[PDB]
């Protein structure tokens, strides 16, 4: 009775209803999240949503012929399980019963799928991003220098600094506009180093 | 009947009409019965005449013929990675771009306010710098009060003077 | 609680959502299975792409092109359906299957 | 000796080699060519166990073979598989980016049952991939090199379990199959046994013996001694043969109603019917040799039997019962013991015959499948076998193996060393094997049955220890799968030189010394104690009469990259794994010096790799040229060898060849006729000698930091050269052609320069990173203009130019010559692509000097980027006036137990400046065992230490203490091995004396120039805009949930704001900071990211409502 | 394994973005059989639909 009071206080404390555990209208998340790119030389790449969403549609549009033509029960109440089965596994795949594999037996990724672990949202991207304005090499000593000091190698510090270069060239007319002054630097001309 | 049409309606993501997939499952049997017969796989040239059609229309039809990939497997065969990570967006804000574009419109405004007002104005309704709406030639002269030759008449002085260099040396950089 | 997204926040409710809030999120109802014409690559009518349930693909440049401009804004192509805006709309509205 | 174009190079070995090394590519052709059916392994199978010589096409053709109907109608038959010639030569197939294959001709066969015709026919079966003459298969132009795998064989694994609680010994037995269905056994903390068969739930025992037909006076008949047994009759609670058959069959399949036959026949179809049940002939020889149930009879049917399975509960039951042995009732008895799964007589090596053979299996069920499906359909009298065989699938299955596998790997070519030790390598993990992160930490462990079958050293350090090993330098491969070794037989207490094979069961059973034993001139001992090594891996000490097997040498445990470790056994192992993984990374320079202390194991290592030209008959060299060498043979005819000069290796270095002998010279046959990339003379040579000193300089060799000499980038010492490749193809796209042209859309005239007439550069046009290297330009059409650029267009009076400009240029940071142009196009009647009219590929070579940051690092362990490079006058300079060439820091080596480098350093001054060892009054008392012709030796004498049998301390001091003078009197190195070093830049001599010698140090292939990125703005992501990743893109530097911790931590919110929104995600917001930084304005305020909105957008679909209130 | 480069089927145009002169619309208002009702702005210069999928 504690087990079950806690679910049935959560739906009776709040302005909840408990008629939303049932569906009549799956939503569809936007076409560039789930985007269809032509890549170079005709070749596609869909986003495994698109065929999940497809078997919901199509079973619906048969159950939609089936029971507006009339057809007896066992094909009907089959009609009815595959949908269910259909939207299951688009909502959560591998949850009940055998995963939906695409080609090459390997399961689809469903809307669940993009959420959990290492690989999902909250920890691939909310929380640690790519970024711009960086790079890498690989260290030396430099017992040279001062304390509050570190060696930067001027072919990466050119590109880490670009903008703040192409301004300063701008203003000391070394060149006419942003256009010439990027060519300037991407070309390295001379007087980029002693602007850097 | 009813499972071969719907398996044609069905089976693939970008569909695929049912008389080409008719004559795609004819071309794939063609060349199979072919590649048995030759010991090797047959050139379009040899499907095309087997089959009364070009080898365009071949190569057209084989090129219909393919599924897309998937954007969701791991192409890092560690496991790291996935291929919808390794895509460039060819079609995005390239963030230079768009400050030149900036730059662009200024020095235009600039030049084109160093003129005379009416020739300014001629230019722009010309060009359709004001709203994005480029205007007729009766339209311009309906509202500026004068006939269709004396303003291309204009126009044409309005032209030749912003191509002369004195004007157009700063504009000439940006293209 | 307001949905454009500027930066004015107090709180971040998440609740269990009914059949009619999903049919008032929704633009549209989806209803076949295709997603682009295999020879134009053009979104199919009524499909998973839908240009006339989802936002148009080009910059204020409506599909059949009756209009094209920026001066064209929010109004309906009464041929095609699609609306005129910009294509930053497609990662922001979603559809409903019945 | 042995190889009769040698350097001689003088050994410090003191043991007699009985056996010389094998082929070192063995494991690779012998079981390719078993495969095939060559006439080769046919002879070696006929003076080896001719009773059944069947090759792998033959044994898949035969398990096949014949197909039949449902009816028995009819039947399809296979035979006789054969091959034609190869359709294209190596280099051809490697040039023009095809496969290197061989036709396949099976003679089918199809009979009528009841009205009686055959109809034989020869079919064709597709292209096979061949092997080369160096075992590496070629796959699209690449070199593809397929490794071998140890998974574990079947059998039956009698374990056991102590439980926690009660503290009693539970048995288990598992019968392991290959596509079969499992069946265990058990003994619980009661007095049941478990009878779990397919991962169902539990049943007593008696229950499966009813079953099988065995009634309960049967059972205590033929278990009459096992109380567990007994009693676990008494409490099977059931009765009936039927009876129990139904239980068994609701346990086991749920859900289908019972009927009589299929209930009886369920269990004798799943186990004894060779359909769905078979353990190979490897795993039916270890069920007979584990109980005994046969001896002499050779291996057939290999389905189980319920003979099987009774003795196998037999054996269970007295193992619980606690016997040491057991006969089964029609065949010799077997000793009772528990299963090591981990014994290296228990993981089988599936090498490239079977892995090949298994894809084959698998392509071949797939075609029957539609054999027997397509034989019904269509009527009879009108089949023939062309037109019931089908080869996609066969065909399919070959292809889908060669590429897109983890065990069809790209060959790691930076060396021959590389090249070779990237075949005799066995990964444990793979397809059939075990994953990475679900492998327990027991199987990464050095069992002691690994002597002589696998390498203690030699793995990879990451994060696959223990999962990938490398074979042993004299092991074989059984014709099952097993690792053999060889050893020497001793009888009597008399080692004779007749040589044995002994696997791992083998050398359980009997007990063998050590190698390193004083033998007394004719096979006696000599002390009366011979150390050994017993059965469960223990060490004793056992008179000199139970001893019957010897090894053949020492160094038998290591590999062939462990193999060239001078001093191995006085450096730790992980320093000596370090230097065996670091020896197969260096790359070609462009002189390649040989060592001047090395291993014998360097010029069959060299001759056996492959990258060395080697002549096949005897006669006399005709012509040298830099291209060819035409030998004249002894009778007649001649032979002209080709070189591969500067041809592009797959990492991207050289593979040049250059020949070494004189236009009027006599060769022998197998003598060394052409070096290779690494090479000297024949035989390996990886780096460059050194002088060193030990001394710790300035700061600037700080933490393993090295500082070289100016010298070495002067004289082109550490130089090599790299060859990149770039690839274009012009297609034809949907609303036109792409041309490869020189007329560019607008651009100026002077990039345009080096191009050609007709696009592409012209040989030897030196390029720079941004430059055009193929001028191909798409078709755009016509589209929207702003009203702008409308505007400037009309100014200047240019066209809209309807066509965009897409060339190849070449990337940031690439330069240097430009070597050849291969343009292939379709004119020509080349095979590219589906669409593709034309690629061309250009070749681009540089020239890589010696830098800071560049990587160095010697044969034990000691690796290090290189500090500061110095003028050769500020170095500190001998007393003579010879500058020292690097300065290793003296602090790494203490801590780390490598003082291999020490002794190789003291062994490499003695041999560089010679020495000479005053025998006047005999012979000095350390050298009384050293051999004759190294009392003395000139300078720049090449010697040789071998690995555990090497030069001792008392010969290293005294070697070090008769040297001989440079030019004048001078001895500049004491007897201790330190010199008196002067500073070079204040003049004054260094207070101590220094250790100075000569070291061979290596130059590895993880250069600064290819590790180097940068980025401020450049492509971004799909899905989510964040920045892309790698350097092969711009790419962006990773910021993660450590790095947000470390920010938070410090309290810098404004940063972690700005790392996290305008730099990644705020897609409205990177373009206004990249207008205000170009405009010099203040940086504006971030916005919300991307990723929030799409999280939103992605829980919203889940169907919650997640709304973001106000106030 | 690549540096694939690929592009969605649309165009990115980028002009002004302004709000004070648009051309002009009106607002139809259309009913369904479920007693709903949907406003669809049309252009001025555009013939009303007697049905329009809502
Ligand atoms: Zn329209």
Redesign the pocket.
């Known amino acids: 009775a504690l087990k079950r009071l806690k679910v049935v206080a959560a739906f009776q404390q709040s302005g909840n209803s408990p008629m939303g555990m049932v569906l009549d209208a799956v939503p569809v998340i936007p076409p560039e999240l789930r985007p269809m790119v032509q890549l170079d030389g005709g070749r596609f790449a869909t986003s495994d949503l698109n065929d999940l969403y497809r078997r919901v549609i199509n079973r619906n549009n048969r159950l939609k012929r089936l029971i507006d033509l009339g057809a007896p029960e066992i094909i009907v109440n089959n009609e009815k399980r595959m949908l269910q089965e259909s939207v299951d596994a688009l909502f959560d795949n591998g949850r009940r019963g055998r995963p939906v594999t695409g080609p090459g037996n390997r399961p689809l990724k469903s809307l669940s799928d993009l959420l959990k672990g290492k690989q999902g949202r909250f920890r691939q991207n909310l929380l640690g991003k790519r970024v711009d304005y960086s790079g890498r090499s690989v260290i030396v000593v430099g017992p040279q220098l001062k304390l509050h000091q570190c060696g930067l190698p001027k072919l990466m510090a050119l590109e880490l600094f670009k903008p703040f270069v192409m301004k300063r060239l701008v203003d000391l007319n070394h060149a006419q506009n942003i256009k010439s002054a990027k060519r300037m630097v991407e070309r390295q001309r001379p007087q980029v180093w002693d602007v850097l | 009947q009813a499972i071969t049409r719907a398996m044609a309606d069905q089976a693939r993501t970008i569909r695929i009409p049912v008389h080409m997939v008719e004559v795609i499952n004819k071309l794939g049997r063609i060349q199979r019965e072919l590649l048995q017969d030759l010991g090797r796989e047959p050139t379009p040239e040899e499907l095309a005449k087997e089959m009364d059609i070009t080898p365009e229309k071949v190569l057209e039809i084989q090129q219909y013929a393919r599924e897309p990939i998937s954007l969701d497997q791991t192409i890092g065969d560690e496991g790291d990675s996935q291929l919808g990570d390794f895509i460039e967006d060819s079609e995005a804000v390239v963030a230079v771009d768009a400050v030149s574009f900036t730059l662009l419109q200024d020095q235009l405004q600039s030049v084109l306010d160093t003129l005379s007002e009416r020739e300014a104005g001629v230019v722009r309704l010309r060009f359709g710098l004001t709203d994005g709406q480029p205007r007729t030639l009766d339209e311009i002269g309906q509202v500026y009060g004068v006939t269709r030759e004396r303003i291309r008449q204009i126009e044409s002085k309005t032209m030749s003077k912003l191509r002369h260099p004195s004007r157009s040396q700063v504009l000439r950089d940006y293209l | 609680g307001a949905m454009l997204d500027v930066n004015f926040f107090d709180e971040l409710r998440i609740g269990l959502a009914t059949a009619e809030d999903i049919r008032q999120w929704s633009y549209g109802e989806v209803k076949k299975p295709e997603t682009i014409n295999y020879r134009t690559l053009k979104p199919e009518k009524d499909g998973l792409f839908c240009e006339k349930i989802f936002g148009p693909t080009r910059d204020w440049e409506?599909?059949?092109?009756?209009?094209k401009r920026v001066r064209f804004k929010g109004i309906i192509?009464?041929?095609?359906?699609?609306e005129?805006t910009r294509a930053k709309v497609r990662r922001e509205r979603m559809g409903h299957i019945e | 000796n042995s190889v009769p174009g040698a350097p001689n190079r003088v050994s410090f070995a003191k043991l007699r080699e009985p056996l010389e090394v094998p082929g070192l590519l063995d494991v690779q052709t012998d079981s390719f060519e078993w495969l095939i059916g060559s006439p080769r392994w046919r002879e070696s199978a006929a003076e080896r166990g001719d009773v059944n010589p069947v090759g792998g096409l033959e044994e898949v053709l035969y398990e096949l073979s014949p197909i039949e109907d449902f009816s028995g109608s009819m039947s399809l038959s296979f035979s006789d598989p054969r091959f034609d010639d190869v359709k294209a030569p190596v280099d051809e197939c490697k040039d023009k980016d095809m496969t290197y294959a061989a036709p396949l001709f099976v003679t089918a066969e199809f009979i009528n049952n009841n009205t009686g015709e055959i109809k034989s026919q020869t079919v064709f079966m597709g292209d096979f991939p061949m092997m080369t003459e160096k075992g590496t298969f070629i796959i699209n132009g690449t070199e593809r090199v397929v490794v071998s795998q140890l998974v574990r064989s079947p059998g039956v694994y009698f374990d056991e379990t102590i439980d926690k609680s009660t503290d009693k010994t539970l048995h288990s037995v598992k019968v392991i199959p290959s596509r079969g269905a499992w069946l265990e056994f058990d003994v619980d903390k009661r007095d049941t046994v478990g009878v779990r068969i397919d991962r169902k739930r539990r049943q007593p025992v008696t229950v499966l013996l009813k079953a099988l037909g065995w009634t309960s006076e049967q059972i205590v008949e033929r278990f009459g001694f096992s109380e567990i047994m007994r009693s676990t009759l008494e409490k099977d609670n059931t009765v009936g043969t039927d009876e129990a058959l139904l239980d068994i069959y609701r346990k086991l399949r749920p859900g289908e109603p019972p009927t009589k036959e299929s209930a009886q026949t369920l269990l004798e179809n799943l186990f004894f019917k060779e359909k769905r049940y078979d353990l190979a002939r490897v795993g039916r020889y270890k069920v007979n040799k584990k109980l005994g149930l046969h001896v002499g009879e050779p291996i057939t049917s290999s389905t189980l039997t319920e003979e099987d399975v009774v003795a196998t509960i037999e054996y269970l039951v007295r193992l619980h019962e606690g016997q040491t042995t057991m006969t089964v009732p029609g065949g010799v008895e077997v000793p009772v013991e528990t299963d090591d799964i981990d014994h290296f007589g228990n993981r089988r090596l599936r090498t490239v015959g079977e892995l090949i053979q298994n894809q084959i299996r698998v392509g071949m069920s797939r075609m029957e499948r539609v054999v027997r499906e397509r034989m019904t359909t269509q009527d009879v009298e009108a089949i023939t076998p062309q037109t019931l065989i089908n080869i996609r699938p066969v065909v399919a299955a070959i292809k889908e193996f060669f590429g897109t596998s983890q065990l069809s790997q790209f060959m790691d070519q930076n060396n021959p060393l590389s090249g070779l030790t990237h075949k005799r390598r066995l990964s444990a993990l793979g397809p059939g094997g075990l994953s990475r992160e679900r492998a327990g930490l027991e199987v990464r462990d050095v069992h002691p049955s690994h002597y002589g079958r696998m390498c203690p050293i030699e793995t990879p350090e990451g994060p696959n220890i223990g999962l990938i090993g490398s074979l042993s330098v004299y092991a074989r491969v059984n014709p099952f799968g097993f690792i053999e070794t060889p050893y020497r037989k001793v009888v009597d207490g008399v080692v004779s030189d007749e040589i044995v094979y002994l696997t791992a069961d083998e050398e359980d059973r009997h007990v063998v010394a050590q190698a390193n034993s004083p033998i007394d001139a004719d096979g006696r001992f000599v002390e009366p104690r011979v150390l050994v090594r017993r059965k469960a891996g223990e060490v004793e000490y056992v008179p000199s009469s139970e001893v019957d097997y010897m090894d053949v040498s020492p160094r038998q445990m290591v590999s062939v990259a462990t193999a060239m470790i001078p001093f191995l056994e006085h450096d730790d192992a992980n320093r000596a794994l370090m230097g065996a993984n670091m020896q197969r990374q260096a790359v070609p320079l462009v002189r390649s010096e040989a060592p001047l202390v090395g291993t014998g194991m360097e010029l069959r290592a060299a001759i056996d790799a492959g990258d060395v030209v080697v002549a096949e008959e005897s006669g006399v060299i005709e012509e040298v040229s830099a291209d060819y060498i035409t030998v004249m043979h002894d009778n007649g005819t001649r032979r002209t060898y080709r070189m591969r000069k500067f041809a592009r290796s797959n990492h991207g270095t050289c593979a040049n060849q250059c020949p070494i002998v004189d236009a009027g010279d006599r060769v022998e046959a197998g003598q060394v006729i052409a070096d290779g990339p690494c090479t000297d003379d024949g035989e390996m040579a990886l780096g460059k000698n050194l002088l060193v000193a030990i001394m710790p300089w300035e700061g600037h060799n700080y933490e393993d930091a090295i500082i070289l000499s100016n010298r070495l980038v002067e004289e082109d010492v550490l130089t090599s050269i790299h060859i990149e490749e770039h690839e274009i193809d012009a297609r034809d796209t949907k609303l036109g052609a792409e041309e490869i042209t020189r007329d560019i859309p607008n651009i100026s005239d002077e990039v345009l320069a080096d191009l050609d007439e007709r696009g592409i550069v012209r040989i030897g046009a030196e390029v720079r990173d941004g430059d055009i290297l193929v001028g191909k330009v798409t078709p755009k059409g016509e589209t929207e203009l702003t009203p702008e650029e409308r505007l400037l267009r009309a100014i200047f009076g240019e066209k809209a130019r309807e066509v965009r400009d897409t060339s190849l240029k070449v990337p940031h940071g690439e330069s240097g010559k430009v070597i050849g142009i291969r343009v292939f196009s379709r004119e020509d009647e080349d095979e590219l692509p589906a669409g593709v009219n034309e690629l061309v590929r250009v070749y681009v070579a540089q020239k890589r000097k010696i830098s800071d940051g560049d990587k160095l690092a010697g044969r034990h362990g000691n690796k290090g980027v290189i500090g500061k490079i110095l003028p050769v006058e500020d170095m500190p300079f001998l007393a003579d006036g010879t500058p020292v060439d690097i300065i290793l820091n003296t602090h790494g080596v203490p801590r780390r137990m490598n003082i291999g480098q020490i002794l190789e350093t003291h062994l490499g001054w003695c041999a560089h400046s010679g020495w000479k060892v005053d025998a006047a009054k005999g012979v000095p008392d350390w050298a009384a065992r050293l051999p004759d012709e190294l009392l003395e030796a000139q300078p720049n004498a090449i010697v040789s230490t071998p690995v555990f049998d090497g030069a001792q301390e008392a010969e290293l001091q005294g070697l070090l203490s008769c040297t001989l003078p440079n030019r004048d009197g001078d001895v500049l190195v004491d007897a201790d091995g330190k010199a008196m070093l002067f500073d070079g830049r204040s003049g004054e001599p260094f207070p101590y004396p220094v250790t100075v010698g000569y070291m061979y140090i290596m130059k590895l292939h993880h250069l600064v120039d290819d590790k180097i990125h940068a980025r401020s703005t450049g492509p971004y992501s799909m899905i989510t805009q964040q920045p892309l990743g790698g350097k092969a893109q711009f790419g962006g530097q990773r910021f993660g949930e450590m790095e947000c911790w470390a920010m938070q931590a410090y309290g810098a919110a404004y940063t972690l704001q700005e790392l996290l929104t305008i730099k990644s995600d705020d897609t409205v917001g990177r373009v206004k900071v990249y207008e205000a930084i170009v405009k010099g304005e203040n940086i504006p305020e971030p916005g919300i990211p991307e990723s929030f909105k799409v999280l939103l957008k992605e829980l919203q679909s889940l169907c919650l409502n997640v709304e973001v209130l106000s106030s | 394994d690549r540096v694939l480069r690929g592009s969605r089927l649309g165009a990115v145009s980028y002009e002004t973005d302004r709000n004070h002169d648009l051309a002009p619309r009106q607002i139809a208002r259309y009913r369904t059989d479920n007693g709903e009702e949907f406003e669809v702005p049309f252009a001025d210069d555009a013939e009303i639909p007697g049905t329009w999928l809502c």
């Open positions: 409506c599909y059949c092109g009756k209009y192509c009464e041929r095609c359906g699609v005129v």
